Design a protein that fits this description.
Structural class of chain A: mainly alpha
Number of strands of chain B: 0
CATH class of chain A: Mainly Alpha
Shape of chain B: rod-shaped
Number of strands of chain A: 0
PDB class: signaling protein/protein binding
Helix content of chain B: under 10%
CATH topology of chain A: Delta-Endotoxin, domain 1
CATH superfamily of chain A: 14-3-3 domain
Oligomer: heterotetramer
Order of helices and strands of chain A: HHHHHHHHH
CATH architecture of chain A: Up-down Bundle
Chains A, C: 14-3-3 protein sigma
Entry title: Structure of 14-3-3 sigma in complex with PADI6 14-3-3 binding motif II
Bound molecules: magnesium ion
Structural class of chain B: little secondary structure
Assembly: tetrameric
Keywords: 14-3-3 fold, protein-protein interaction, SIGNALING PROTEIN-PROTEIN BINDING complex
Shape of chain A: globular
Chain lengths: ~220, ~5, ~220, ~5
């Protein structure tokens, strides 16, 4: 993508999203990041949707194959999909480390990128067989939590999605279901108390993510 | 298993 | 795939189908065809499911992008997807021509492959801007029809799916809606009259495809 | 537009 204009990459990412061509969408957004300029809010969302969909298909496939696994063919093919998943997570982590996080000074950008760092170390942990990868996810989520608590209101959708994902990290990855349940409860309750401050459209944005926290609390208790 | 953020 | 055993390719195609990894499934089945042995019935179905899903995603994307098209970016990206679709159709046509069709002597195999040849020329025609490609689809479907009428009963599922697809070719590609409607009606009626010959399981197989013929007749009349 | 064979 080095020969393509930044604006054309961004335009084609949006076309690829409409076409449900998520591998193309992630390749266009990788090329836009590698132009070296910081991303706007809408561009950071495009980067995240593209990779979420790519890695989401790889995670689903890896879970089907790992279940069948429980000749060498099932293990070889699960290994094949696992390696490709690890490569996509390494690519995202590499964009964050060169140089999205270091250039991100506003809280909205910095928390978004540190949450992504946590997420893609978490996806590495889901397949790992591990301590160091779990620690790297934890450390990224904790830095993002610290900034979000100081800099954003409790209803901010990035803060809420970070706390949701850190709660899933604690329940599924770190074997800390009580920490998961405490974080999801505290986050839901502090957001409920701040909803009165919001417009109708912001209220809809924040209550949609709060419902996910509640859906997990209903699964966990 | 447990829904994460959109 | 040259270093992988045929049986391991077939096993991994089946794993890829379970995992909804259709590009991998088609690459495994391409490697199995290129071993040079004829395919069994279940292997021919694996080849067709894999490519149908790959090309089906490309057709859907091409339709979204062609609709948006109605700077150079929308046309460039529609061209990008179109070229990749044409490459998948060329790959399938190339497997059929080297050497699946020439080695196929039983009617079940030969009609299946000639129907596939018709289908993938039809997908080329959907994007073409053309006469020669439409003629190549027609010629492949007509050879398959001629064999199927002589060699298979009117309820045979390959015969029924060929007549369904040749009817869609006439309505959507060749601008012959009356030929489409006549073929779908005649095929439905001749199959209905032969259902009494079938087991319960064959009856279910044939009536499911007859319902597609009826669904198109309801759209077309 | 018009369903084809599975
Ligand atoms: Mg900055
Ligand atoms: Mg033969």
């Amino acid at each position: 993508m080095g020969s393509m204009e930044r604006a054309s990459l961004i335009q084609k990412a949006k076309l690829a999203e409409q076409a449900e061509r998520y591998e193309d969408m992630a390749a266009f957004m990788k090329g836009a990041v590698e132009k070296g300029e910081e991303l706007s809010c809408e561009e950071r969302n495009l980067l995240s949707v593209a990779y979420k969909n790519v890695v989401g298909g790889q995670r689903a496939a890896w879970r089907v194959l790992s279940s069948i696994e429980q000749g060498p063919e099932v293990r070889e093919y699960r290994e094949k999909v696992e390696t490709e998943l690890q490569g996509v997570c390494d690519t995202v982590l590499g964009l964050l480390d060169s140089h999205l996080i270091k250039e991100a000074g506003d809280a909205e950008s910095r928390v978004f990128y540190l949450k992504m760092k946590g997420d893609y170390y978490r996806y590495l942990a889901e397949v790992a067989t591990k301590k160091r990868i779990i620690d790297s996810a934890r450390s990224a989520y904790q830095e993002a939590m610290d900034i979000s608590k100081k800099e954003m209101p409790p209803t901010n959708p990035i803060r809420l999605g970070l706390a949701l994902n850190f709660s899933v990290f604690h329940y599924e990855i770190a074997n800390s279901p009580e920490e998961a349940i405490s974080l999801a409860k505290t986050t839901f309750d502090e957001a409920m108390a701040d909803l009165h401050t919001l417009s109708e459209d912001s209220y809809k944005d924040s209550t949609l993510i709060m419902q996910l926290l509640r859906d997990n609390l209903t699964l966990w208790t | 298993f447990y829904p994460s953020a959109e």
